[PDB]
């Protein structure tokens, strides 16, 4: 009722000159260009175009003014400390087919929050210390109005990861509500260059990278491979227990082909994580007085 | 998940005295400031991942009730789950010990703590459904993945010095007084600032005393995360016998 919505109908063909009409101006008004605006009333109306030079050439569009529900639009939810996370929102109606949205949404003023996971009892107006949270909600700038990155999106926010761990994010408007859980994490080796004699062997250890995805966990992986399609003649790579592996020397590393062992750790795409974290690191290798 | 069992108090009659909301907000605003540094305590339990044992600081010499909160794996708590059998454990029954409350199989249990300082791990498991409640309802058993039905917590079990001194009256002669035992979050007070000034910093273990006049200073301390043993209401009840 407060937030009039806008779209644009376009005519193709005829004598290049038009007149525009609406069968109910209390639901939708049309302009001389084909822009349409919702008015004080919901329901159903028709918008009509007519050729000036002989009014028998004409066509019409149906406009319907109707919502049920709000979601946070799916994005990545695993991010590093010191980075920002984009979250957006989308409107639904239970009158729409599954896989159909509204053609446009301007409803940007949403009640976005960060939620704290321990706040069970204390109905008290205390200024809680903004030190224990993993995340913070960023301010909206008062710069020039952006183009929304898609037109169906009600509102968009960024959340800065301050500290390791997680927070819940929440949204409300007119009783409709959404929530999501977001995580702050980075990957490292102990060894920075693996330089070994003929037949010498080393154990290598690693820290950080994603947890096995909470709900499913079999979507997780660790992966360890070298930058050659032919490995088994030059080095032997053997995974260890937990975050460890082994490198055993087989033959001399040619200096015109520097060898790197890549460690990847991540979650695979699922129906509960569509945009998972999967970082890697490359570790240099060599086989070669007193 | 393990949680501390916050029992209701007695349902005293609901007077509508609006003034109570002010003193509730005064306590909530103090609690919101205290929540910056109370984070290590058993009252600050953050919802764990499966197998993610948390260390929590707790004071010795008391009994404490705990609750085994059961969820579906959508994350909803169940409305009733009085068909499951529970398994209450501790790593050391000297340091921390489950009592012999009547229902040793229930989703509630009472933990007694020693008079020491130290560390002990508490655990609850589920063993399955009760076969006799299922048999009475004529229901078939369905076999539970009890490997996913365990929760654990690590409990870390936990004075001014000098207690008496004689300060020679000179504006350069300052005493340090330091708070041995507590959360390292302290507030210091004294009987009479005309005898001596106090000086301390936020989150200091200690306060400095500066001599203004002859006499006796008394200095006192409150713990910001653990409070003070001056719980007078319980002292009224015991005075009839003690």
From TrEMBL, chain A:
Q: Which domain of life is it from?
A: Eukaryota
Q: Where is the BIG2 domain?
A: 1-61
Where does the record place it?
A: Nucleus membrane
What does the similarity note say?
Belongs to the NUP210 family.
Q: What is this protein called?
A: Nucleoporin 210
From TrEMBL, chain B:
On the tree of life, the source organism's domain of life is Eukaryota
Indicate where this protein resides in the cell: Nucleus membrane
Q: Where is the composition biased (Low complexity)?
A: 19-29
State the residue spans of region: Disordered: 10-29
Name the cystine pairs. 38-225
The family this protein is said to belong to: Belongs to the NUP210 family.
Give the protein name, as stated in the record. Answer: Nucleoporin 210
Q: Which organism is it from?
A: Dictyostelium discoideum (Social amoeba)
> Which gene holds the coding sequence for this protein?
nup210
- Entire protein: shown range: 788 to 1032 of 1916
């Amino acid at each position: 009722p407060n937030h009039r919505q806008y779209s644009m109908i376009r005519p193709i063909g005829g004598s290049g000159e038009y007149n525009w009409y609406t069968n109910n101006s209390a639901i939708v008004t049309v302009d001389p260009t084909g822009a349409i605006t919702s008015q004080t009333s919901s329901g159903q109306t028709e918008v009509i175009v007519v050729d000036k030079k002989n009014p028998h050439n004409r066509d019409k569009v149906l406009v319907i003014v109707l919502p049920d529900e709000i979601i946070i639009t799916p994005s990545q939810v695993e991010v590093q400390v010191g980075q920002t996370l984009k979250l957006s929102t989308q409107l639904l109606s239970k009158q729409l087919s599954k896989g159909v949205h509204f053609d446009s949404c301007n409803l940007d003023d949403l009640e976005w929050r960060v939620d704290d996971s321990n706040a069970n009892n204390d109905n008290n107006g205390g200024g809680g210390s903004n030190q224990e949270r993993s995340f913070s909600l960023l301010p909206l700038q008062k710069t020039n109005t952006p183009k929304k990155e898609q037109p169906d999106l009600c509102s968009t926010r960024e959340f800065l990861a301050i500290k390791e761990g997680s927070n819940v994010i929440s949204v409300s408007y007119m009783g409709m509500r959404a929530k999501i859980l977001i995580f702050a994490y980075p990957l490292k080796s102990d060894q920075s260059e693996i330089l070994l004699t003929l037949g010498s062997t080393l154990n290598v250890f690693f820290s950080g990278g994603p947890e096995p995805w909470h709900l499913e966990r079999k979507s997780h992986f660790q992966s360890i491979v070298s930058n050659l399609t032919n490995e088994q003649n030059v080095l032997s790579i053997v995974p260890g227990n937990g975050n460890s592996f082994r490198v055993t020397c087989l033959t001399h590393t040619n200096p015109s082909k520097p060898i790197g062992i890549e460690l990847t750790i991540g979650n695979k795409v699922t129906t509960t994580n569509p945009y998972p974290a999967s970082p890697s690191i490359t570790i240099p290798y060599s086989c070669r007085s007193i | 998940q393990l949680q501390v069992a916050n029992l209701p108090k007695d349902h005293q009659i609901q007077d509508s005295s609006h003034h109570q909301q002010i003193q509730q907000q005064e306590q909530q605003q103090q609690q919101q400031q205290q929540q910056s540094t109370c984070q290590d305590t058993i009252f600050s339990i953050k919802k764990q991942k499966q197998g993610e044992i948390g260390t929590y600081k707790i004071r010795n010499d008391r009994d404490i009730p705990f609750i085994a909160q059961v969820f579906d794996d959508n994350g909803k708590p169940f409305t009733n789950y009085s068909s499951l059998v529970f398994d209450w454990k501790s790593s050391d029954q000297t340091q921390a010990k489950w009592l012999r409350d009547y229902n040793q199989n229930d989703h509630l249990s009472t933990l007694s703590l020693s008079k020491e300082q130290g560390k002990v791990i508490i655990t609850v498991s589920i063993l399955g459904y009760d076969q006799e409640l299922l048999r009475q309802n004529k229901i078939r058993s369905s076999d539970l993945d009890t490997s996913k039905l365990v929760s654990s917590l690590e409990l870390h079990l936990l004075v001014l010095f000098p207690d008496y001194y004689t300060m020679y009256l000179n504006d350069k002669n300052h005493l340090k007084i330091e708070a041995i035992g507590g959360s390292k979050n302290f507030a210091f007070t004294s009987n009479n600032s005309k005898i001596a000034s106090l000086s301390y910093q936020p989150n200091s273990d200690f306060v400095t005393v500066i001599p203004n006049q002859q006499g006796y200073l008394k200095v006192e301390v409150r713990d910001i995360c653990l409070g003070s043993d001056n719980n007078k209401d319980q002292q009224q009840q015991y005075q009839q016998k003690q």
